[PDB]
């Protein structure tokens, strides 16, 4: 039980690790989106943890479910959707003016805020000692 519902923005996409993905990413991911084009992409890959729902604030109870405690999602509606039955998850969004709207008004949600390559720097440095391959 430490599975991200990965909620994929069409931004620079992770082709970098997408071959350990199916080693270490499958393991502790579950890919949660609206798209089957990027599911079958991923099923093509070897994901067996793949959900296709087209529904916003019913990944609350997916991920409920699941017992997901993070989640990678530009979501303001869906943020206040998921923090009203679940305060112990951890979502990550890029609106900052809604990030401190949620670490306000919800005490116990961890909600992170996303801008610049600095809050994923210091994110990674949290987290397990993971480099990027320089050309």
């Known amino acids: 039980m430490r599975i991200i519902v990965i909620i994929v923005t069409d931004e620079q996409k992770i082709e970098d690790m997408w071959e350990i993905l ?24 070897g994901v067996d943890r793949i959900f296709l729902l087209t529904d916003d604030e019913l990944i609350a109870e997916i991920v409920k479910k699941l017992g997901a405690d993070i ?14 039955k679940l305060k112990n998850i951890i979502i990550l969004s890029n609106d900052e003016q809604l990030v401190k709207e949620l670490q306000k008004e919800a005490s ?17 440095e949290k987290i397990l000692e993971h480099h990027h391959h320089h050309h």
């Open 71 to 84: 989640v990678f999602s530009e979501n303001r509606d869906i943020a206040k959707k998921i923090i009203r």
């Open 108 to 124: 116990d949600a961890r909600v992170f805020n996303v801008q610049t390559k600095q809050d994923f720097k210091d994110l990674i």
């Open 22 to 45: 199916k080693e270490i990413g499958v393991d502790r991911i579950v890919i949660i989106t609206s798209n089957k084009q990027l599911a079958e992409r991923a099923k093509e890959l």
